[PDB]
Amino acid sequence: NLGLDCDEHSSESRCCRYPLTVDFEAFGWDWIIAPKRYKANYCSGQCEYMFMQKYPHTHLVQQANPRGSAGPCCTPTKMSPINMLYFNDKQQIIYGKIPGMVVDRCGCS
Amino acid sequence: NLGLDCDEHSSESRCCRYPLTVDFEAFGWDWIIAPKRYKANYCSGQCEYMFMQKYPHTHLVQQANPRGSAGPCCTPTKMSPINMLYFNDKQQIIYGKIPGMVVDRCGCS
Amino acid sequence: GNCWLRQAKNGRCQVLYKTELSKEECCSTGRLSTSWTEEDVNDNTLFKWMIFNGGAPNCIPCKETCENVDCGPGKKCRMNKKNKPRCVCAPDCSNITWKGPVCGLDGKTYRNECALLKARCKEQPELEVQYQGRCKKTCRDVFCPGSSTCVVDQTNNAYCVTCNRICPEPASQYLCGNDGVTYSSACHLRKATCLLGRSIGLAYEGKCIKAKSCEDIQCTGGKKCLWDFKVGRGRCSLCDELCPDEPVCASDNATYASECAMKEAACSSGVLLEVKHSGSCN
Amino acid sequence: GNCWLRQAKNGRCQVLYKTELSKEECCSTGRLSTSWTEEDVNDNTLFKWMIFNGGAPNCIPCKETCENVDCGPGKKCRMNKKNKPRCVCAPDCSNITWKGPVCGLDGKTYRNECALLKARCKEQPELEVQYQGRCKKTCRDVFCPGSSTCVVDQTNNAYCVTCNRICPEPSEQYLCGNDGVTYSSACHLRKATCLLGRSIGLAYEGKCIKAKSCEDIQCTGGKKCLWDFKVGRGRCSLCDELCPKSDEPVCASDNATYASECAMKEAACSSGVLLEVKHSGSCN
């Protein structure tokens, strides 16, 4: 609702959330038991003007334009965890909720 | 603590928080009564490899390297409000806590 | 080895700052929390530790004591009870002559200046004193320091502020305040407001006209005219906001379900209504 | 005019998407919440509205009904009781033969498949069924579908997972499990663990040795030897972690009470005696 969703055959130029599946086996990571893959998604698009901005600080940096200050970037503004079953350092079977695995929303920061 | 702070006397290339004073009068914004100025700070620096990263999603995107992914950006990972006294649209004197005005910490997202 | 921004409270290293480093290089600065791990490992190992095992193991803090710790300005390194170095707030309160309470910019009263400076350091970096003594309600007997002057906000809290005095002249929108006064610009309306010490409010854009009803007033921008029978003047109000409570008594001496319910009744009838007191009129 | 991502509950427009647009351009797509304001204003007006006045006024939503609303796959537009269009979850439960309860990947039992699919749509995009029936404790009478087999986690919850059984077979990749069994690599330890259905655990890198104390075992990599007096075998444990809090007391295998499981681990690491939680709570 507060975010914009796009797919690959979208012509949306603005900061947007695109689909992306991460496959743990295709990385070779046998220490992850489940899931084998999941929808991680990612952010991509332009951040011009005041568009897609959540916090007023962004606009203020743009005005000040200090040294080394890059324009706003299209970046996650909301993240979700996934539940995982995996082997820890002791090779124990561990279930855990892993934060910051899924991008729910993209915005200009 | 979870973030790195720099000043003009830093040769730090990594994503870092720098000082930045915002002067509302010097912007011409008379509709802000107080404060006349405040420390906003800003984020600046490189985001390479796994440095200065908080969430695992970033690393997973770097590996996948999907189309339109610009790489991690140096961006606020923690924001603070400031208290403000200002004129609303009705030109009423309003006191309010305004979120997302100060950058407390910068990181690679 | 690896260089980390901090040792977490579980004791493991977090936030990778640098790789392939000796402890000496990693710990060469005065930064309090910087920590080091000896083992050089590959990316997927660092990742497993950071994300799935609480951080990098065998985390060695660069600073085990306050020695060579640079806390920066306003802070000093003190060993805590668990004998671990912490940068605590220690501002300079020695050359402060006022020893009574102070009113902070946050509208909160602090026990003294030093207390405010410590609250400034711990939680509000923008916190300053706006005037001496306790924060007050209404501007009565609030003597603002220097050239600053007193105003109240929406809940009648007193503030000492610097009004804008040099408005830039408009090439020329004139504004009509609720006071029936025409102002050359929003800047001028604001400065009259600031000097008055309380909200005047915008009646409508443009010159004030001697209206005899809302028919004389053209409201712009989705606004509707509401007539104030107490002063015989009109106002353009948005009447757009939605209302989701407070029972109230309105200036028409009627009881409404809410100020929200009252405003809607006002917008409906074209009659300006304001809260007289909370509770039923009976 | 201006195009906005949503109308807030205060009725105002929020999150600026596009400027200098007509209502028709702004509302041309099937997106539910897109909203529009007519007045073209300057940045500082826009900024004042968004940050200091709750959003842009005179917010006009593009979609007041379900017409031309595209909720996407798995969802359908329905007018609610207050007559506003909402994209609700409406999965296809048509061709589902199992009508009983199911165990979700999140370890929660759902009343049926359709319910899980509805929870998948609303809140958990990764949610799937791992096995039919209720989620269970222990793998006893958990019959996993297909090639998947049963394992339990640290709290004895049962999962149906697909063990990968193709290890690259190989040096000093040898590991000594807590079962006193030597494994050629971590992969084999993992697959043996996965096949056993429960954690075996790594005692120490290298071949298992018939140690009679921790003196016989050299721990590599900052680890310390801890001795298990119940089975007469040692293990190399990290012993680096600190204890922070609202701790919950535990009863350990030495029949003593500790402030927390973490406090127990420290006493274990100090004394060189393996300690494990006997039961939760203080030793009565």
Residue numbers in the entry:
A (entry chain A), B (entry chain B): 1 to 109
C (entry chain C): 1 to 172, 175 to 246, 251 to 288
D (entry chain D): 1 to 170, 173 to 246, 249 to 288
Show sentences the authors wrote.
The complex of the GDF11 dimer bound to two molecules of FS288 was resolved using X-ray crystallography to 2.35 Å. This is the first structure of GDF11 bound to a known antagonist. Similar to previous ligand:follistatin structures, two molecules of FS288 bind symmetrically to wrap around the GDF11 dimer occluding both type II and type I receptor binding sites. As expected, follistatin domains 1 (D1) and D2 overlap with the type II binding epitope, whereas the follistatin N-terminal domain (ND) occupies the type I binding slot. The overall structure of GDF11:FS288 is highly similar to that of the GDF8:FS288 complex (Fig. 3a; overall root-mean-square deviation (RMSD) = 0.657 Å). Nonetheless, the structure of GDF11:FS288 reveals minor changes in the positioning of residues in the helix of ND. For example, F47 of FS288 is pushed inward to accommodate the larger side chain of M50 in GDF11 versus V50 in GDF8. This is consistent with other ligand:FS structures, showing that the ND helix is quite plastic in its “molding” to accommodate ligand differences at the type I interface. However, examination of the type I interface revealed two unique interactions in the wrist of GDF11 compared to GDF8. The second unique feature of GDF11 is the formation of an additional hydrogen bond between the backbone (Y49A) of the pre-helix loop and Q62A located on the C-terminal side of the wrist helix.
